[PDB]
């Protein structure tokens, strides 16, 4: 439930204005909670694959990483309201989401 939690407070900036998005979700969203759907590949190129609960709106986006997964999803749900996230010019293709 709600009532009665520890409270996990982890922060890195390992990466280079990546993690900006992370604290930018908690600062529009504060209180959030990621989770793993499911993991594939191998050990070494694993696939984390996040997900995310925003204005009723569910993200998610795997990585090379769980660090970066929970990062990526963050930038979709800003991109979605239309925010600021750092990134452009990368055409997905014939298909759209």
């Known amino acids: 439930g ?4 520890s409270g996990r407070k982890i922060l890195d900036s390992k ?15 504060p209180g959030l909670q990621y989770k793993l759907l499911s993991q594939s590949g191998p050990v070494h ?9 925003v204005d ?5 986006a ?7 997964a929970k990062l990526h999803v963050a930038v979709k749900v ?3 309201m239309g925010y600021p996230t750092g990134f ?3 055409i997905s293709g014939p298909s759209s989401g």
Request: charged share 20%; net charge negative.
């Open 88 to 90: 452009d010019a990368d």
């Open 78 to 80: 800003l991109q979605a």
């Open 45 to 53: 190129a694993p696939v984390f694959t996040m997900s995310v609960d």
């Open 2 to 5: 709600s009532s009665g939690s």
């Open 56 to 60: 009723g709106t569910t993200y998610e």
């Open 15 to 29: 990466a280079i204005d990546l993690m900006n998005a992370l604290m930018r979700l908690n600062q529009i969203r």
């Open 62 to 68: 795997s990585g090379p990483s769980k660090k970066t």
